[model samples]
Target: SKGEELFTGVVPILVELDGDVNGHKFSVRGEGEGDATNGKLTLKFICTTGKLPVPWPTLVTTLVLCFARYPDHMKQHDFFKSAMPEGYVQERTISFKDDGYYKTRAEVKFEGDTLVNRIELKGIDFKEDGNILGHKLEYNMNSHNAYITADKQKNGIKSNFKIRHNVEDGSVQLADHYQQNTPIGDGPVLLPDNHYLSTQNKLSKDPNEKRDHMVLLEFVTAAGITL
Candidate 1:
């Protein structure tokens, strides 16, 4: 039900990997807990192969950054309206090797203490030094998951990928086909001790087969962030 929102407790968000890193099969789980004013998060990568790829750090940072913005999204919902309503918007630049960079933007608006948030990455170009680094990257957020996409181009050819991390189930899906399920555990999972359920979005498999819409592109790179 919409009554329970996400992030009220130590909710787990899972990251699934496609064979792009190597033949290695692995996943990362993030536990999140916080309020509209304060919070903290942590992650653990459970690897079957035990060996990590070179891009591991970049991938992990990207995941945390996405989840870090989730709490504000829930304030907009009716169940968890804040006592003191306010709006905040932020922007920063993501810099990669060889002058590659991305323009990032995030905003949160208030409707009498309800919250609506928008996150965006624009003007992504990783080939500033003539070297064809990964072309671009962007992220979008909903109450359920974070959608991140990567792109590359060579000789007029282009490739794109999108990955989704389910914040409630600890599962991840790549392109709707490839998915890594949450690990099975023995007992009931509980939020960290002594914490109250301030807000949450419970995990549910609704009638819709997919939760998001797709947008394709040309020579440039871009991604849409929505909730």
Candidate 2:
């Protein structure tokens, strides 16, 4: 149901990556390490985007796309598959300001480091606004940890475990159906970035129809992950 809309109506207050924004596909690779000594964490982000639904070039494509790239676009792609619910957003903000235990929507726990957890990837990430029609460009980001639960000593030995996002308040703002208006040149006009995109990309292909659109995301999360 959510794959119907386009970009989420939110400004990119903060963004980090080097994505291949050529066609309709996009990919991002990032990593962060917690600094227990300094009571802080450092993070780095790297990303890329390419054509969507890449055609498999026989065995080579399948092999490289899965095993070689591993998490590139295969069965065990944690980033994509794990965060399938939270599709791509037109804009988002991330900050490590909240220093309190907050309730999150998802949680990931480990028992004696034995029991493994797996998440499913399922969602439609579109770059362009499809509205009620089809689309071309699309991507996704599975990063959200608003709610979480902990089981320090479940079924075995005792262990102290703690989790928190170094990104403070990584609030993801998205919406559907935005408003827009025309402007002369680069003059100051009304309507925010999200609305403009949504209204411009209407569902129909008409001479005087807006094609831009509002973004749709089925949010998801687990463990110590944040957006």
Candidate 3:
């Protein structure tokens, strides 16, 4: 594919997020560009407990919860900065920082040049200390519906986990145990009716977990071509 030169030599922006959330330590760093037309951008996150899936919502929410507000530095790639104000629209991707233990890939979409309408994350897998698991999450702008799946297999046997939201009542359900075709966790829970709510609530309710609520994201290096 060839077109008139829009110019040449474009450098990506490198960003790093280093800090802890409620005592849950994390170190995230990577680079990306807003020029989706001719660029590729990616961000990765690493946590104390191996690698946490850096899904868009997961990453965004974690930052918000840590600082109690959105950090201004991340505006370059999403929700701010760039041509559209929601980051680079043409070529952007996110993942988990490499630590020889986990891997991840994520995608995000914008709406009306002002809102982030879609976020889908996949290929988030864990491989360390003999623990194997895979994760996937999806969210829609219109429906506000979220789907989460976790799969684990051992000794040729597979165990699947699922979490889905109830849009009508704002309730979330968690289920476990699955065989070839059998599945559970869709209809009942002994602890909390809403898994998503309870987890977020736990972040503030638990004393030991609320010790650290600070996050720092900084721009380490940024380069681009002169037009």
Candidate 4:
């Protein structure tokens, strides 16, 4: 629990690949006079795979959280059930062994200016608790198809020109044009891009989907960062 709390303050980093390097080389070190004062955790990412700007948090946060959230992460995974505010029920476990998602080494890094980042994951492994990646969901451009339309009214704002899925043919009306003159924002902002374009083709009804609305984008990316 203490280790988890410490890592929460830090943001993970990521890099993209173009050549041999698949991931990045990273190490976490702690710095401070003591535990209660100017304590800080520093993350170092070295490009051992290739060089291309990708999403950082997706990689680092995913790996770090996978370790923190699941159980017996270092070993092979299997269906192991445990109490989750309920009782132990059989569950399938995966990681480097079964899923082969995370690699042992990292090979990506941060480029120069321009808000670009890169990282590699040979494959990320997950724990059996079924709770992976910090008990949260993160999305990146590499994995998501994104769209953008400049905000004509706001000085430095962008509209969520998302390619929504779950849309039935006659469900919702396609807005050909709209206007926004006031600074008061409208519509869904900071919505997660679920790559709904290729999957659902448009929006649809999610009867049990929890949020402020029934049909909504749940996951969210960083400001100015879209997949």
Tens digit of per-residue lDDT, candidate 3, span 16-81: 444332233455543333232232222332243445433223343222100111123322211112
In candidate 4, position 161 carries an lDDT of: 28
lDDT string, candidate 1, 1-227, tens digits: 12233334443333333222222233332222233223343333333334432233233323312123323333332212221123233344444444334343434333332333334433244343222233122222222232322111210111122323222234332222111111122222111111112111222222442322111110111123234
Candidate lDDT values, in order: 0.28, 0.19, 0.24, 0.23
For model 3, the run of ten residues with the poorest summed lDDT = 189-198
Candidate 2 lDDT tens digits, 31-55: 3322211212222222224322221
* Candidate whose lDDT is highest: 1
| Model 1 clashes, total count | 8
| TM-score for each of the candidates | 0.28, 0.20, 0.24, 0.18
CA RMSD per model (angstroms) = 19.4, 22.9, 20.5, 22.5
Tens-place lDDT per residue, model 4, 155-194, is 2122232221111232221111111111112322221222
Task: Assess the local accuracy of residue 72 in candidate 3 as a C-alpha lDDT between 0 and 100.
Answer: 30
Better of 1 and 3 by lDDT: 1
Clash-forming residue pairs, model 3 = 22-212, 34-88, 36-90, 36-91, 77-87, 175-185
By lDDT, the better pick of 1 and 4 is 1
Give the total clashing residue pairs for model 3.
6
Clashes of each: 8, 34, 6, 36
**TM-score (C-alpha, index-matched) for candidate 2:** 0.20
Can you tell me which runs of candidate 3 are displaced by over 4 Å?
A: 1-10, 36-49, 53-56, 60-227
Could you tell which candidate, 2 or 4, scores higher by TM-score? 2
